[PDB]
Symmetry: C3
Subunit: 155 residues, 3 copies
C-alpha cells in the first residue's frame, strides 16, 4: 500500500527566519522510505486515492556555538500544506508550534512540534512542509520528519 516517512536533508536549507517550504527530504537512507507516492522537490505527491494519516515532527535547536538567535522572542512554527498540479490552489491542513524565548546565556535551547490528522486525498494532490526559522532545524532523521500512510480506500 501507499506510505512515506521522509527525513530532513540538512545539506539544503535556506538561512533566515521567513516561513519557508522545506524541499529536501530523504526517502531511502535510514528510516526514510516511500511506497507508491512519489517525492517531487520536497512535495509528497499522492498517486492513489484514499484516506491517509499525515504526520510531522519538527525539531528546533540553538547552540550558543552557532552564534545567537536572530530575535529574543521567536516563532517556531510548522505548517502542513496541500497543493495540486491539476490545480494551483493551496491549503493548510495542520498547524502547530509556539513562540519561545531563547534569549539569555542558556548554553542550549531545544523545542519540538508534533502534528497529525486523518485526511481524504486524491491522486495528484501534493503534501508539503512549511516552517519558520529553518536555520534552527535539527538535521537528525529522528528529529525532523514527516510522512503519511493510507488507512482505507476512499468513498
Amino acid at each position: 500500500q501507499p506510505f512515506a516517512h521522509l527525513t530532513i536533508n540538512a545539506a539544503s536549507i535556506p538561512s533566515g527566519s521567513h516561513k519557508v517550504t522545506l524541499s529536501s527530504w530523504y526517502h531511502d537512507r535510514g528510516w526514510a522510505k516511500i511506497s507508491n507516492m512519489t517525492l517531487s522537490n520536497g512535495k509528497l505527491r499522492v498517486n492513489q486515492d484514499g484516506f491517509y494519516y499525515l504526520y510531522a515532527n519538527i525539531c528546533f535547536r540553538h547552540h550558543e556555538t552557532s552564534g545567537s538567535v536572530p530575535t529574543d522572542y521567536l516563532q517556531l512554527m510548522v505548517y502542513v500544506v496541500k497543493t495540486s498540479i491539476k490545480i494551483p490552489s493551496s491549503h493548510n491542513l495542520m498547524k502547530g508550534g509556539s513562540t519561545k524565548n531563547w534569549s539569555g546565556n542558556s548554553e542550549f535551547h531545544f523545542y519540538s512540534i508534533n502534528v497529525g490528522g486523518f485526511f481524504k486525498l486524491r491522486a495528484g494532490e501534493e503534501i508539503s512542509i512549511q516552517v519558520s526559522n529553518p536555520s534552527l532545524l535539527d538535521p537528525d532523521q529522528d528529529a525532523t520528519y514527516f510522512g503519511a500512510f493510507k488507512v482505507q480506500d476512499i468513498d
Copy 2:
C-alpha cells in the same frame, strides 16, 4: 469504515480559565468530516466496535492587546475524555499541555498541543474535548481539531 476529523467551531465558544468542554465542531466544512460515528454536541459517539486511533490538536494564541493573562503563569491544557453508558463516569484517556507565561508587556503569543493514541472503543461510547482558557483558542481548522478512525476489528 468509521472515522472522523472535526474542526473547532469558534462562533459557539465561551470564556474563563476553568477547564471546559468544547461542544462546537464542524463535520462537513473543509477538512471537517465524519463516517459511521455521530457528532452530538462535541461528543463524538462511536457506532462500531474496534480499535481506533484517537488524536487531537489544540492551538492557543494571545496578544497583550487584550491586557494581560488571568494569572501571570497560565495553564494551557487539553483532555481527551470518554464518557460511557455502562457507567457515566468521565474518564481521561490522554492529557497534554504546559505552563506558559504570557503576562507582561509582551509580543504575540502562540502554543500548540498534540495528543494521540491507540484505544479500544465499544459502540455507544463517546469522546469529547476539554480545554482550559478556551477564550485563547485558535479558530482556524488547521489549528484546532480532533478526530479518530478504525484501525482493526476488536477482540
Copy 3:
C-alpha cells in the same frame, strides 16, 4: 493483529538529570493493553514483521512545594529507541521535548511531549523509551504512555 499501549508504573523510578531508560510499564490496568508483542523490562519486543505506527506521550510536572529545581534551564527530552537482537546497539527512531526554565518562580509547572511515526519493524526487534529528568514524570496513565500497532504487512 499486533499492538500495544503501555502506561507508566511510577513505582520503580530513580532521579537525576541524565538520559535513562524507563523499564516500568503496565499492560493490564486501565488503558494498558498488549497483543502479540511482549513487554520485557520496558522493552517492547516485536514478534511479527510489518509496518507499525510508533507513538509516545510524556508529561512532566513540578510544584514549588516539592523543593527546588535542579537548575534554571533543564532538558525535558523523550527518545523512542530501537534495539536489535542482532545488535543491542541503540538506534533513535524519534525524539522530542524542549529546554524549559522552571526556576525563578511560579507555583506549578507542566509540559508534555508527543511523538509518533510509521516504521518498518522485523520480529525480535525491541522498542524502548528514554527520557531525561525521570523524577519529574507524571504517573497518571493518561499523562504518560507509549504504544505501537501494525498497519500493513511488510514488503
